[PDB]
Structures are given as C-alpha cells and as structure tokens.
Amino acid sequence: SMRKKIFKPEELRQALMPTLEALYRQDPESLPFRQPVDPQLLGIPDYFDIVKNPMDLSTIKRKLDTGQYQEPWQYVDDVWLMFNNAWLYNRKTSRVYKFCSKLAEVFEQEIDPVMQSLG
Numbered sequence: 001s002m003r004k005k006i007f008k009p010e011e012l013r014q015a016l017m018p019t020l021e022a023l024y025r026q027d028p029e030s031l032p033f034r035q036p037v038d039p040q041l042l043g044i045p046d047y048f049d050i051v052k053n054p055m056d057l058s059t060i061k062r063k064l065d066t067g068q069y070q071e072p073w074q075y076v077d078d079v080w081l082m083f084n085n086a087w088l089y090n091r092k093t094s095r096v097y098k099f100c101s102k103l104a105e106v107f108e109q110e111i112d113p114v115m116q117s118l119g
C-alpha cells in the first residue's frame with residue numbers, strides 16, 4: 001500500500017510486547033539474548049568485526065518502551081536482526097546457534113496472529 005497505517009505507541013506496545021515476552025520465557029534458550037553481547041567479557045574480541053549491527057532482547061524491549069517503533073515491521077526487523085546476527089557468528093554446533101533457532105521458531109508462531117490483528 002502507499003498509505004502506511006499510523007500506529008499509536010501504546011497500540012504497538014500492547015500488541016507486540018506479548019511476543020517479546022514469549023521469547024523471554026524460553027529458558028535456557030533466551031539467556032544469551034537478554035543483554036547485549038559484551039565481546040570483552042565473553043572473550044570474543046572478533047565479534048564486532050563480524051556483526052556490524054548488534055541487537056538483543058533488552059534493546060528491543062527498550063525501543064518498544066520508548067516509542068522507537070512507528071510500525072510493527074520495524075520491530076520484526078530488529079528481532080530478525082538479532083537472529084541473523086547469531087546465525088552468522090556462531091558455529092552451527094554451538095548452544096547460542098541452536099538456542100537462536102528455537103527462538104526463531106517461537107517468534108514465527110507468536111508474531112503471525114499479532115500481525116493479522118494489527119492489519
């Protein structure tokens with residue numbers, strides 16, 4: 001469409017926060033994603049050489065709380081950025097990679113009816 005529907009901040013928050021909470025509820029799968037990757041603490045100094053645009057659950061939560069999303073696709077894009085970052089950097093045998101794959105399955109399931117409700 002050429003006429004982008006306007007979403008109120010609280011409309012986006014009420015619709016989308018339950019899908020973020022569904023990711024947070026995955027335990028242990030969400031544990032590596034609840035805070036930004038700290039490459040120095042984690043002993044992986046090559047991280048920012050590979051991941052140019054970091055993203056995590058706490059950043060997305062803050063963006064939802066502060067009205068930084070004007071439409072739901074922006075929120076979906078940030079969640080997918082988090083996923084694609086983990087699938088890019090981590091080896092396929094690693095816990096973070098397999099945990100990412102589980103979160104993406106959960107997010108796909110939860111986000112579909114919500115995007116239909118938002119129109």
Ligand SMILES: CCc1c(C(=O)NCc2c(O)ccc3cccc(O)c23)[nH]c(C)c1C(C)=O
Binds near residue numbers: 028085096
């Ligand atoms: C591997 C480092 C890393 C974490 C992380 O936080 N590792 C430390 C960690 C925890 O802080 C809590 C639970 C973990 C459960 C398994 C493996 C971990 O490592 C875990 N999160 C992301 C997105 C990455 C990368 C590079 O993509």
